[PDB]
Amino acid sequence: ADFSLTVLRARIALLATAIGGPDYTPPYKLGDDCLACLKDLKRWFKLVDDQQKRWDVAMAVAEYRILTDDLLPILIDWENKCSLAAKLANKAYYDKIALNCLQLLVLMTWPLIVTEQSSSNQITLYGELKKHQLVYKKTILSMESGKVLRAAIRLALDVIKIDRLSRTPRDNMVLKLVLNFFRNVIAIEPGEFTINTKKSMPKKGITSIDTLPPNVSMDDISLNTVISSFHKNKVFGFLLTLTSSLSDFINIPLLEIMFYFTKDVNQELLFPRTSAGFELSKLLQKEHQMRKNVIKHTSARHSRFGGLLSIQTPDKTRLTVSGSQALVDEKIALQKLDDSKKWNKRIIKKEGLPNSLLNSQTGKAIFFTESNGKHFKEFINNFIDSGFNILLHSVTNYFTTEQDRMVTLEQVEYLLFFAWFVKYQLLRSKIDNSADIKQVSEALKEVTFILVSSLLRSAYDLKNWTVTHAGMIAFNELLNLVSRTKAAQDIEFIVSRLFSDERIQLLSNLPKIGSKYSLQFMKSCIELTHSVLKVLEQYSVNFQKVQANYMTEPVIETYINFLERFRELEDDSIKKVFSFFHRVFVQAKEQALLFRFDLIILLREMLSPDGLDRMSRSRKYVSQFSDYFLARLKKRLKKSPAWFVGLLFPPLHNSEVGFYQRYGE
Amino acid sequence: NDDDNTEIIKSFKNFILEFRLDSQFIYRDQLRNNILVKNYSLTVNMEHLIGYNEDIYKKLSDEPSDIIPLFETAITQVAKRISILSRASLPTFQLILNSNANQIPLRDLDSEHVSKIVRLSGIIISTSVLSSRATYLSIMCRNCRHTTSITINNFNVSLPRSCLSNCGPDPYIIIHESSKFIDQQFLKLQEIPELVPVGEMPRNLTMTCDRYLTNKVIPGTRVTIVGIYSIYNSKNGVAIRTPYIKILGIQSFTEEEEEEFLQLSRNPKLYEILTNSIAPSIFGNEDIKKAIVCLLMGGSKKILPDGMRLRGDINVLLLGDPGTAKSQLLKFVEKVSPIAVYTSGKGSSAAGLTASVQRDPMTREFYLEGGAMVLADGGVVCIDEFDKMRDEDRVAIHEAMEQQTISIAKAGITTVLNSRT
Amino acid sequence: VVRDEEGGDYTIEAGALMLADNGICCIDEFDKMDISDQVAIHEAMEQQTISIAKAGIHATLNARTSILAAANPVGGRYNRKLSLRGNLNMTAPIMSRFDLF
Amino acid sequence: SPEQTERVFQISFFNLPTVHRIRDIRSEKIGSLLSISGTVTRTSEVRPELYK
Amino acid sequence: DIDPLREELTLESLSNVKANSYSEWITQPNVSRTIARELKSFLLEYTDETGRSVYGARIRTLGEMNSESLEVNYRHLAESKAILALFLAKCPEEMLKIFDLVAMEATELHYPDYARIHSEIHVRISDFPTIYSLRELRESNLSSLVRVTGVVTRRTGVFPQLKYVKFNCLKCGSILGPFFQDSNEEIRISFCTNCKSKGPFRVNGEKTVYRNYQRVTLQEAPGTVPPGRLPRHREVILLADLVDVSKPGEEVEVTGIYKNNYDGNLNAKNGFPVFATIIEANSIKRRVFSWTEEEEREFRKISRDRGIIDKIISSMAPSIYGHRDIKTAVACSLFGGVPKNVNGKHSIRGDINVLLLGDPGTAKSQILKYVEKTAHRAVFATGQGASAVGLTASVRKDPITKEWTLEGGALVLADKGVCLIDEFDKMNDQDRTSIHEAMEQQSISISKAGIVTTLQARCSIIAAANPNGGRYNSTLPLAQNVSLTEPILSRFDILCVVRDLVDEEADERLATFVVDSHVRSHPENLNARQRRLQRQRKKEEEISPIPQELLMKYIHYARTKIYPKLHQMDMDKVSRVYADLRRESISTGSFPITVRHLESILRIAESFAKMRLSEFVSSYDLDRAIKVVVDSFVDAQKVSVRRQLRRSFAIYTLGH
DNA sequence: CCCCCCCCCCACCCCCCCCCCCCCCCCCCCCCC
DNA sequence: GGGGGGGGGGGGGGGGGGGGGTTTGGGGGGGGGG
Ligand SMILES: Nc1ncnc2c1ncn2[C@@H]1O[C@H](COP(=O)(O)OP(=O)(O)NP(=O)(O)O)[C@@H](O)[C@H]1O
Ligand SMILES: Nc1ncnc2c1ncn2[C@@H]1O[C@H](COP(=O)(O)OP(=O)(O)NP(=O)(O)O)[C@@H](O)[C@H]1O
Ligand SMILES: [Mg+2]
Ligand SMILES: [Mg+2]
Ligand SMILES: [Zn+2]
Ligand SMILES: [Zn+2]
């Protein structure tokens, strides 16, 4: 009964007044029994919300604003006490309330997941609870330039001073909880707007997906604020010296922080590869091309002015359209007739992990401030230059064990970590000769390959498509690195036989299945496939034998369905698709498999005036391909007019006519 | 609760049948005598109901809108028992209340008086035409022709929302031949002028009466009303309601004033007596006072064999110097004359003099409303400072003063009104 | 005093001596103004208010204005053989309200 | 402390290149920043528009 | 540790607000219970400097009046438990519900079973420090308590409105629990909570209770609105005890809540989601004449001075030098006579009407402007600024009801007061003729648009006028000095003739007085505020035998409490005076002596006795009244005869 | 030239629409050839 | 190893229910008569 909930909220409100407040004689001042009150609040979290799976206390604590109005004041004032004392050297007690404040922050910032195992109460309360965590993240990053962050590192430093052995289990746990605090503060992110599907949709959809609370803007939550507050509290320095000092109880949270820093930021944004106004002028010219295009597709006179075109077909029958531009351009008339159809084919549809490169829209970017850009790129630079190989060895040498018990989230975050920093160092080393590929040498050490192979193989066998996609990305970066070191050169030949047979088959099977999965899944399949083919060509077991495993129709469907997003794709992605087509069609000469109308449609749309950029390099590749493709299609139809029907359909898997269809004698 | 209503009804029946003072059963006598002259009502003094059994008065005054119909029903049953030999048809009798509860002045009535029996007083400033309200509706379903009925008590019903055993959504209709109706009239009561607060505009109430209380008052009469202060949700604020009174009683020749006026007629000094009695504080002006007596009495109105009709009304103009007591004489004549209206020439407009168009807020439809001449019909219109009146107003006086009519064509309403003034 | 196009009921509508409140009012051809209007500004010149009672709306609006009046003498041409009394069509109620000529 | 709301910000441009007349209103300039001139005939009651 | 139904907080915890909005904090039940205890302690323990509890005494008085309203002074709450004053300012709708419950608790403690007399108490928040003009209100004031100045421009009727209302669902088991009605919108029932579905709904006729309701259009004061702008307005809503506390055409000061609501009409016509707004009034104050028991005793004390009449008359318009006959007439008018009615048959005017006729620059307008500040009910109108209807009464077709209603003119607004008509000579005669009825018969008899009625207009009219052509000309009699006719002139039953004669010893004293008065009025000329008030008091005593602040309360007291009688007056003295005045008034150009002038002597003698707070009129009052009227007549003459008339009438006046 | 007049201006059925329910189609998964 | 058949989800159509759709007074401007 809700009587219990209002009683609980009354209790937490009374506890909220017990913690402390401002003293007018303004400074924050602790309450009587304040340590016992903090312990009792920790006990409320345990006693009710954990033990009964409710999150009611986690809601009530936010209602009475304890985190923002008591705990961060306590920690920041305690930080100032200890800072001033350090310069000028009953802290034995106040240390305890600082620690219990940190425990409460770790609890209240603890990441939220919703599953079939969650209670009905939890999944009901999930949204507003996420919103309150976002207010917490804003306050933690903003308040006194986030001085509580230095409070957290100081609490950790006061057990890093003592010996490696002298750090007791309590000290080890305390350092781990400090890492979980920083991880959580990175990890809070706006929740998904999750809708009941029993009742039908109205005549309009959801009015907005925005789930922020009114006192928050997205910039308050953005990475930029994280970088600024972490720099101004030297959290980056703390993490860098911590990973340098590793010489392993805390290694998994320490990896996890770097994952949460990397999961959604693109490496190219840290490299350039009147400047802002100049580039804005470039952007505006580019969209002005689309303006002149739609203007060509627009009437010179008012909408009520419309006369009627009639398209008499090649047969003695007539259609009718009102388009004034179409009246003098039959292309527009035909396509407008097709646009007018009310009918569509109905299309069928298609969680405990955060948003990332695994599931973001493919053009998403963090727009850094240049100070934060410098601070972040130099932080991850110094990490790579110190902490990478040691950390990766520590955690991968963990993950050699306990693979059967590795939780799905842990698997995907490990794979993303691997991929992200390997990709970054490859890119930086392409940009700087001063940067060295050997600085990520741990990636190529054979245990790492074996584990990544075990992860991808088990994920695919389990049909865990999330982790399969993660391992697919990690494999792409492993192969990418392999190609770079094959040029920069032994271990290359080791992995180039260890990946034989069933691994070749597995890699050949992802782009068969990819057509059934999201754009990013398909993109990673294409990326992996391009890397695989360039690797095998660089080596060249037999080259014809392997590529035959790729040149099959579901792979062509996956490439087509990827290419169907052509406007939203990037020039390099289209280049990779058309290099694959160059191989299949020009080099391998299995041209019959691409004589199908879906490709014809897609080629026309992208070569259209409202298709690709006229100046695009990828448009040049498409044009080159299309010229050769049309010439061969004309030639095959001239030799075989049955293909005028066959163009409509999948090719005949009946070999006895299929060979004749494929080659025409 | 029908047993409880039956015991209320039987309690009232016992009150009619048993109440007696000084050896006379006053309400049995009054009910029988009312039946003989074929007015089906009973006038009850609530002092007597209190004196009989104050529990009944407490029930009545706690919720009159439920208790009054039961009292009416009890009166019908006793009426039959005292005027028809049963085992060898009358309508629903109207209850009429007399009271001496302390009056609430018309301005002080507010939300705490809603549905209480209230006693007040004022001037009736308008009296609408009669209107027909249903008492018994004979009701038919449009599809299946299932017939039923509504018996109505007019103290505050609607047609039933759907058929009382597809039959359509909103199906019922009234059978106007078998349904029974009663007369209803609307009155507007203005507060007594000498009770208006300083600098206030005089406030007024709309109020309703039915059966034998219709046509019982005319505009300008000063009355005391007994009624239920009550509410209705008009079409024209938010969560607001229009107040009104449902009248339950009105108080506004006798066989000995007949004798008094015979004796006064027989007095030889009568004309001097009446002359002295006009404006007694005004010294002198003897012939003018004599003429005012003549104007008050009037001549004799006549009709000829041709249907032609001749003025009985006298018109008098007092033209003269300042401070000669002219206005004082007019403001006296407005007191003594049984029907009178006082206006001043500069206060007038032709509309407010003859008659005007109105749109009734209750029906929300047009009706014509009488001006000063009509309200003075049967008496004197005292037009003070007449020399200040505009020319068009003095034109409008002509028909009402000499033809003693007002001819109308306004809002499409063609009409002619009488002005014996 | 006018009807409001929004509310429909009456309202005050500001004349020039209100726009010139805490300011100056300049009148050309003042002697050729109707006496109907010369007797209207008498309050504003001295009591520095406009008092109104019309259409059931009552007001006393501020008219703290310095008035500057361009006047012609009677018949247009001045004659110093006459008094300033005789040179003007004005009379003592309005001439006394002016400070200096 | 009591919650202080987020502050709204108005970006008031001024000193534009030219003033267009009311008669120069032409619908391609919909959504464009302009400067305009005329004489004010009436001004409304100040009311709260529901912003968010 | 403690029962959750009784957990309660410290005052510093209340200062330590830790819900998000203030209202979210007030509605937290521990905070609510604490606030209840806090306000109860405030009412029972805040005191006067005498140590007497303020709200103990105000509650005692509340019960004696059987009132529903308790006037809590906000400044008291700001002095003690100031956090509650902050919550009351920032969040009045929640706070006032709590404070109402607390106030009912306090008075139920003081009077057992006051729940039988009223089921509720409303606190009225008096003396709220910050004030806004109607132009000055904004979005940031929404839901805030405000204190506003304006004039009540249009007041509707006293309608009932729903307060607590159970509703009936016409499906299922019908009843729904009681909704509380606001001032802004109709109740909505999205679904019936029993059947959890849509349906028809209807008011439950047994369990519903009503309160009084009245909208008022409140508008900017004309002495406040800046130039070049339309005056702004808001719909005030009055509830319960506040209805008809004011009447149109009067200034008010309004403590209330500035609340908005959705309205599809405003959105429709404006094309933006723009909300309507009101001021839900919490208290209304009119904006001096009220007095205390010590002030009553002071009036008695000073009145028995045998010189009080002349000290009053000198106090009239004290910075106006000389003009003692004007000040006498103004004193007589402002105290008035006694209205009468013989047996109900013959009502007699009590008011005294005064005309100031004279030259330019002789303070006539300033005398009227003095009386405008000095009288309890008064209004001021000038010349072509008036109209006949704007002066007596008018009618309008109400935009709400579409019925015709009266609206009072100046002589209705000044009922039981005095009406001030400047430039009486330069009104149109089609406006002047409207004065006649109200000025003598004390009434206005409208017959317009179906309305036919007589209003009370008990006014003394004081009028100021210039003679014909521009100034007075004593070669002529009155009937040629002025355009006004005998009827209207006979109603002005004292005439003052004012002349600007050059006279050196009078002009030097006058000019010295005017210059002294100018510097004594210059702007630059027990704390600092009180100290300059004490200097101001001595400056007032430089010219005024009694304070104006005292005189106004003395006037209002004398008017409302004192009713003189002509016990044993000298009949033959008055009768011979009237007979001789009538005989000498046979001169066809002279002031028309009439029976109403005889009544004027009697009214004036009553007014002088009223100045003495006297139950009985003395010979001295009647002699002074005769002398005033005789002087008024004698000076209304061409100078060729004035000396002879003065000599003849001297036998009546020079006995005193 | 001044004042008064008078003229103007203003305050029950049928359609659209929405909600609810049932069926049919299309995809996925498993078995059979 | 591919194609058919069974089972479940999702979308579209069709039906049913409901709500909406001129007089009177006042002020000011403008023109005509004494
Ligand atoms: N003969 C009289 N006897 C007694 N009182 C009189 C007499 N004549 C006049 N009065 C008084 O004088 C006043 C007369 O007022 P009123 O009735 O208006 O006179 P009037 O004839 O109407 N003059 P006017 O209104 O200017 O046309 C009242 O106050 C009377 O009491
Ligand atoms: N006796 C006086 N004492 C003081 N001030 C005076 C006196 N006589 C005239 N004044 C001044 O004269 C000025 C004008 O006064 P005012 O009230 O307009 O006189 P008035 O007689 O009404 N002139 P008018 O409006 O043409 O009839 C004011 O500012 C007064 O201060
Ligand atoms: Mg008269
Ligand atoms: Mg003056
Ligand atoms: Zn039926
Ligand atoms: Zn229901």
Side-chain angles (χ1 to χ4, degrees), chain C residues 52-68:
Chain C
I52 278 174
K54 296 182 176 182
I57 182 64
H58 301 77
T60 298
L61 312 97
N62 289 324
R64 299 155 295 197
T65 86
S66 287
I67 302 203
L68 179 63

Side-chain angles (χ1 to χ4, degrees), chain B residues 110-111 188 198-201 203 236-241 281 323 327-328 335 342 344 346-347 349 356 358, chain E residues 155 160-162 181 186 211-212 215 244 344-347 400 403 408 415 430 437 441 445 447 449-450 596:
Chain B
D110 74 351
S111 304
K188 300 193 78 174
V198 296
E200 277 290 331
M201 316 308 290
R203 196 175 304 289
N236 291 44
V238 293
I240 194 171
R241 297 292 181 264
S281 47
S327 298
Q328 282 287 357
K335 294 175 184 285
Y342 178 95
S344 60
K346 191 57 172 174
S349 183
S356 64
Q358 307 289 330
Chain E
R155 182 197 69 184
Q161 194 216 28
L162 296 161
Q181 174 54 52
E186 304 295 334
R211 64 186 170 202
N212 309 336
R215 300 220 313 274
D244 286 356
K345 301 175 188 168
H346 175 211
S347 53
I400 293 164
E403 77 181 347
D415 181 28
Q430 77 93 226
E437 189 196 329
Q441 272 67 55
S445 299
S447 56
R596 49 179 55 127

Side-chain angles (χ1 to χ4, degrees), chain A residues 47 75 77 193 195 200 249 327 338 377 465 473 512 551 560 577 656 661:
Chain A
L47 174 65
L75 285 160
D77 284 358
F193 190 87
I195 55 135
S200 301
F249 176 89
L327 198 133
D338 207 54
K377 74 189 284 190
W465 303 111
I473 296 153
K512 298 182 175 77
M551 298 186 292
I560 285 165
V577 168
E656 73 205 0
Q661 173 172 24

Side-chain angles (χ1 to χ4, degrees), chain A residues 65 69 215, chain D residues 1 3 6:
Chain A
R65 294 174 52 105
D69 295 356
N215 54 2
Chain D
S1 295
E3 181 67 1
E6 183 191 51

Side-chain angles (χ1 to χ4, degrees), chain A residues 204-361:
Chain A
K204 289 282 97 166
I206 292 77
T207 192
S208 279
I209 305 305
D210 182 15
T211 307
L212 273 57
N215 54 2
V216 168
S217 82
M218 191 64 190
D219 191 72
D220 310 341
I221 302 303
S222 67
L223 266 296
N224 280 295
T225 63
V226 185
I227 307 314
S228 293
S229 299
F230 275 40
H231 188 77
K232 288 191 75 180
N233 290 264
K234 307 295 176 177
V235 182
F236 297 128
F238 168 81
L239 295 173
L240 285 169
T241 193
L242 175 56
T243 187
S244 178
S245 75
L246 184 56
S247 50
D248 293 50
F249 176 89
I250 53 69
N251 61 352
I252 280 151
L254 188 56
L255 158 67
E256 196 164 40
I257 283 166
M258 303 304 294
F259 158 77
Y260 272 102
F261 256 118
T262 44
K263 65 181 184 61
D264 46 20
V265 50
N266 271 60
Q267 289 81 341
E268 56 267 29
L269 304 174
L270 296 314
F271 304 107
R273 170 57 185 82
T274 308
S275 302
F278 173 81
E279 188 165 78
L280 175 58
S281 177
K282 172 179 283 193
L283 262 295
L284 289 168
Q285 288 298 105
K286 282 183 175 185
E287 49 161 69
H288 193 67
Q289 308 313 298
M290 306 303 163
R291 271 184 281 286
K292 62 181 285 195
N293 267 290
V294 72
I295 286 287
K296 287 279 282 298
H297 208 284
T298 298
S299 175
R301 296 189 121 100
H302 64 94
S303 185
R304 265 73 182 199
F305 195 78
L308 276 301
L309 172 67
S310 183
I311 287 288
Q312 178 153 338
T313 82
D315 301 3
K316 299 173 184 287
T317 184
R318 284 183 188 175
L319 291 301
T320 52
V321 295
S322 40
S324 59
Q325 301 298 101
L327 198 133
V328 206
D329 278 319
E330 67 284 337
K331 291 172 171 173
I332 303 173
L334 272 43
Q335 91 87 49
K336 173 170 171 63
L337 168 60
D338 207 54
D339 287 354
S340 70
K341 277 78 172 281
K342 290 181 188 175
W343 188 249
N344 309 286
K345 171 174 170 64
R346 54 184 277 172
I347 303 297
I348 276 62
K349 69 207 297 190
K350 194 173 182 177
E351 171 63 312
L353 50 129
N355 302 286
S356 52
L357 270 57
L358 204 73
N359 74 333
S360 65
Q361 186 267 352

Side-chain angles (χ1 to χ4, degrees), chain B residues 40-53:
Chain B
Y40 304 125
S41 70
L42 190 70
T43 301
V44 175
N45 186 354
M46 294 195 290
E47 176 173 319
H48 296 167
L49 183 53
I50 291 159
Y52 176 73
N53 181 2

Side-chain angles (χ1 to χ4, degrees), chain E residues 387 389-390 394-395 397 404 448-449:
Chain E
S387 77
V389 273
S394 64
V395 295
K397 200 172 181 174
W404 288 96
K448 292 184 174 176

